[model samples]
Target: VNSFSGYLKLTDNVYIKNADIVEEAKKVKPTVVVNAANVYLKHGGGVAGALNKATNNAMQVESDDYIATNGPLKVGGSCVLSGHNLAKHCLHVVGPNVNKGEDIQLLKSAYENFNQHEVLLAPLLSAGIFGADPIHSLRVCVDTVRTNVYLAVFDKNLYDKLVSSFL
Candidate 1:
């Protein structure tokens, strides 16, 4: 199946998940995968690290232009890069610094920037090291976008928490 817990349906076409992001990339064959990228476009760690490895450094190469031209995406802003080893493309977004009130808009903006009708896969924005609240952040994402959002969850504990609260 597409989701491990039968898809925690948040809204029509929007779902949270507990699955390997790399494996999920192959399943849905998403055209674009979104990742939280720092301003420097450095995929040194976290979701960015996993993705950079998965994509075989293609993201880093493609990211050069954006970094040089834009000088790190503004909070809530995004830039698309070739998806190399994963999807057809990937979106690198500078997620908001965690001010719950301000961050929701940043999360929403990132989702809103995605191409319409494209199969999109994304991690929970700023949920890892950024320490943004997952449930609240996801609620904001669902509220602002109308795409089939596949949330990748590689950790059991995180998955359990999400299921308990949302499913």
Candidate 2:
């Protein structure tokens, strides 16, 4: 496991967690909870899936509606919708699905899109189900944003790995 914690020193409010993302989002009452989305609006699996279930597919419905009217969402771009379960709003960004390197740029775009906001909760952009490098993605995510960020990790293995890396 690589150290994505390099983003730690950049902000005082940015957080990393291995617990439930929905729960953490509630705890923060974030202005927006960012989710890694694709151009196709497929929120059936991965973090997107979980978020859909948590929000009762409200997030995905909005995103799909956006695409339906606006065509495919571009990389490094996003849409905002009312947060259903926990977040005040949802920042749905198009994360990279093909080339892993593109995930960093896209993730940065996702977080940076919400730069005007105060607080946010996000997952490891493009990692796991998306196959993006978690370490590099976090480095970009943490380095690019000034707003408070809460990064969620559901996997105990990943959680322990990242936690130990910090020590």
Candidate 3:
């Protein structure tokens, strides 16, 4: 199997790694593990799917319940929920869908919302099914996150792109 493991020391607090988000979050036990969520807050696919599966679907159930109480989350909006077996909490943020004419600012807002947490474990937001370019997404993440951050990247191609940009 082809495996990649490398880290970038962006600052004293910020680090990027080619690792599984859930597994790394488990080891770090961050304040929250970020979920690249949809408007409906459904934990069905991509990073959300991995988190949901790891938590035994409690994450999905809580998201469904949250939506039942609140409405669908708007682009750039966020909500916090129990992390179940993973971390202390799951921070779900709906990033802009590039295909839907959403701008980079919305994605920036998504990262800005993470200001509330001191320790964060996040994937490259919007870089997957949402059609965001990995380079653009990583730029926003690196620029915005000020607190301790562990950026977990799963795709080798995307990881290479992000790592090369920093170097």
Candidate 4:
């Protein structure tokens, strides 16, 4: 029912059966992004939570470069994944799960795929929380990847002013 509403405005299926990974692979036009979402392994949040970010099971992604997340790519196990072109959905929000590693892998792939143009505002494990301290991760990501970053929290006023500088 909820999925139906999200799809209502589009003639094409808004909720892809598998979110067209092959089509996503070619979205890297230098400024494209694929998104993902998933709850903690049975983390209570369902596919909708995954939708907040998207999911990695679709495919590996990055500019085909500069990507890193800590977890298995899960097509099998402990494998890193990358892709060429994928539609720019950006903003892959995720909560943790028993298989939080899988969700983390998705973030890595998206970050890898859009190294120069990636924008993440969520974390590897955040759900059912009013506000997520994403700035920490965002800061660390900058320190780790050492690049430009743009971040916007949902309602953080003061921190919002200070965090984006991490990039």
Task: Give me the candidate number with maximum lDDT.
Answer: 3
Model 3: number of backbone collisions:
0
Cα displacement (Å) at residue 4, model 4:
32
Give the winner by TM-score.
3
- lDDT, candidate 3, at 129: 83
lDDT of 4: 0.29
Higher-TM-score candidate of 2 and 3: 3
Give candidate 2's total backbone clashes: 0
Error of 2 at 31 (Å): 2.6
Q: Write the per-residue lDDT of candidate 2 for residues 1-167, one digit (tens) a residue.
A: 22223223334656786766766666666667887777667788877787788878777778778778888878777777778876778887776764545545566776577576676677877777778767766677767878777788778798667666642
Error (Å) of candidate 3 at residue 165 is: 1.9
lDDT of 4 by residue, 7-88 (tens): 1111121111112222223332223233333311111233223432343433323312212334423321221123222333
Per-residue lDDT tens digits for candidate 1, residues 1-167, read 34234556667777777877777776666777887787678888788888888778877777877788878777777877777767777788777657433454567776576546355788877777766888766766677667677778778798788768773
Q: Every model's Cα RMSD, please?
A: 3.2, 5.5, 4.2, 13.0
Give the candidate order by descending TM-score.
3, 1, 2, 4
Candidate 1's C-alpha lDDT?
0.73
TM-score each candidate.
0.83, 0.80, 0.89, 0.32
Residue range 1-167, candidate 3, lDDT tens digits: 11213567676666788888978767767668899999898888889998898888988889889999999998998998887888888899889988778876788898887888887888888888888887888778778877777789887777777778773
Q: Which regions of candidate 3 are displaced past 4 Å?
A: 1-6
Task: Report, for every candidate in turn, its global Cα lDDT versus the true structure.
Answer: 0.73, 0.70, 0.82, 0.29
What CA RMSD would candidate 2 show? 5.5
- Separately for all candidates shown, the number of backbone clashes (residues 3 or more apart, or on different chains) is 0, 0, 0, 27
